């Protein structure tokens, strides 16, 4: 293996892989642990690098090489005698998990061997490696799932503590199962997360959560709206979008599951925004967040600015995605508008009506679309013909810099006297990159929602909401880093303050 299972076992404990006790394949895990120790000693000997890596790759992996001045070949001959004493009929294949956290922990002396080797790549389904693989079968225990119907003594099934490692899906506390049914010899695999299956409009849907099953308050039958805001922060849906998840979804199943790892690409762009928040060199620090319309972003980001204020200590402002639409609907007539931050924040309440929703509502009635049922019947060529007529009213604001222009609005708010130093701005589509500004960090936010199923359900806006989603969707590829809500919360925790 790339990371030594004997030293680092706590790393493999996460994936559900526990070491067998210590057998022709068991002696091979001790040999590979002696080969890692012999490499790290030779590596740290010269500047942390292996001197002739093509030999080590073949000697270890193919086992076909024997070697027999003091710097050059004295280290290889120490490796040649170690592997010759193993008397294996064949070498040891270099093994790597497909996981991204795993590949980033590999020691540098193995990375030098990887170019000369054909590493076996173990696929991870949910992030947990597949136990059906050969190398995971012999070196590690093979789990056994206890469920409601499956549960009985270890003597019923054939089970030995030295082979199978129990996985408790029964919902009863592991202290019960261990004590009452006589599993005290067996080692339970512990998962800190959750995995849910919701009913959906189009079929069955799965969801992963970073909350424990006791933290998340849900059981079988519980509704999607119950504990919504816990799911909104920590949840991820693993099914292709659109998923059928709606407000009337119910839980079919729950099981404990491995907690997800936040992408190092998101935590890299998010920690690029936290270097601006801290640095005395930067004057204004803005984070531009894009999301599909209807994804529940303003519910989340308003509480992201609370966690960012409490940890940093600075004051953090938030401009909702509709801040400009609602400001213009008032001030389009006034020839000298007020750009004061606390003023814009007042018009930003949900009870106001945005300007674009007014221009788009006129555009629908002119085609005779009064109802969501009618907008579903239109052909795709017919919808895009209507949407191109919104793109003509969207350019009008972005195309220039005026007193009412969108470039000017976010300029007078960001440069104001009383506006906070750090801001969080929400765009609908990528063309605002040149308008909402000026940043080295911009991200696109995915949540757990079906944004076409959310704009369909809400009885307030109706069509005008669903029509604007599709218009913005058509203008918003994912060309910026994708960030989930729990990766922005994990980004603050991993950042060290003061």
């Amino acid at each position: 293996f790339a990371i030594d299972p004997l030293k680092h076992s706590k790393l493999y404990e996460e994936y559900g892989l526990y070491l067998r006790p210590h057998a022709p394949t068991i002696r091979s895990i001790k040999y590979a642990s002696l080969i890692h120790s012999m490499l790290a000693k030779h590596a740290a000997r010269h500047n942390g690098t292996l001197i002739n890596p093509r030999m080590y790759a073949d000697m270890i992996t193919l086992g076909n090489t024997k070697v027999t001045d003091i710097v050059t070949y004295k280290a290889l001959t120490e490796m040649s005698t170690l592997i010759e004493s193993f008397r294996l009929p064949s070498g040891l294949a270099l093994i790597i998990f497909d996981d991204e956290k795993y590949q980033s922990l590999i020691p540098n002396y193995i990375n030098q061997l990887i170019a000369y080797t054909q590493p076996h790549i173990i696929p991870t389904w949910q992030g947990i490696a597949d136990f059906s693989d050969t190398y995971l079968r012999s070196y590690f225990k093979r789990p056994f799932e206890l469920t409601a119907s499956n549960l009985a003594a270890p003597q019923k099934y054939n089970l030995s503590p030295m082979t199978r490692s129990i996985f408790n899906n029964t919902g009863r506390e592991d202290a019960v199962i261990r004590k009452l049914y006589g599993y005290g010899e067996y080692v339970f695999i512990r998962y800190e997360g959750c995995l849910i299956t919701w009913t959906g409009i189009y079929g069955e849907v799965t969801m992963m959560v970073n909350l424990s099953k006791r933290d998340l308050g849900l059981d079988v039958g519980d509704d999607y709206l119950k504990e919504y805001k816990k799911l909104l922060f920590y949840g991820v849906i693993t099914d292709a979008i659109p998923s059928g998840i709606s407000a009337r979804s119910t839980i079919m199943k729950i099981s404990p599951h491995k907690m997800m790892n936040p992408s190092g690409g998101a935590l890299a762009v998010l920690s690029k925004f936290l270097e601006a928040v801290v640095s005395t060199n930067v004057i204004n620090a803005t984070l531009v967040v894009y999301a599909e319309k209807g994804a529940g972003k303003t519910s989340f980001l308003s509480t992201y600015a609370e966690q960012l204020s409490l940890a940093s200590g600075q004051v953090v402002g938030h401009l909702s995605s509709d801040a400009y639409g609602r400001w213009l609907a008032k001030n389009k007539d006034v020839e000298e508008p007020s750009f004061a931050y606390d003023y814009v924040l007042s018009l930003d309440t949900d009870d106001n009506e945005s300007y674009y929703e007014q221009k788009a509502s006129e555009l629908l009635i002119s085609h005779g679309i009064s109802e969501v049922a009618q907008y579903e019947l239109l052909s795709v060529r017919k919808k895009i013909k209507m949407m191109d007529e919104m793109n003509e009213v969207l350019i009008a604001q972005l195309e220039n810099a005026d007193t009412h222009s969108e470039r000017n609005f976010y300029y007078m708010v960001s440069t104001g006297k009383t506006t906070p130093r750090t801001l969080i701005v929400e765009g609908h589509f990528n063309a605002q990159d040149a308008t909402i500004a000026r940043t080295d960090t911009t991200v696109l936010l995915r949540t757990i929602n079906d944004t076409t199923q959310a704009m369909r359900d809400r009885q307030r806006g109706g069509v005008v909401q669903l029509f604007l989603r599709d218009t913005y969707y058509r203008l918003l590829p994912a060309l910026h880093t994708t960030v989930y809500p729990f990766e922005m919360l994990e980004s603050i925790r991993r950042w060290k303050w003061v």
């Binding site: 409009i201 189009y202 979008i241 659109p242 059928g244 579903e376 052909s379 795709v380 060529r381 919808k383 895009i384 079906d450 076409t452 989603r469 599709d470 969707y473 058509r474």
Partner: peptide, 21 residues
């Protein structure tokens, strides 16, 4: 009644390969 197709993301994908003359 509704389908995995009426969604716009999808209608759009197909609009893309049997583009509707």
């Amino acid at each position: 009644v509704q389908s995995r197709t009426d969604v716009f993301n999808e209608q759009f994908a197909n609009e893309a390969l049997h583009p509707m003359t």
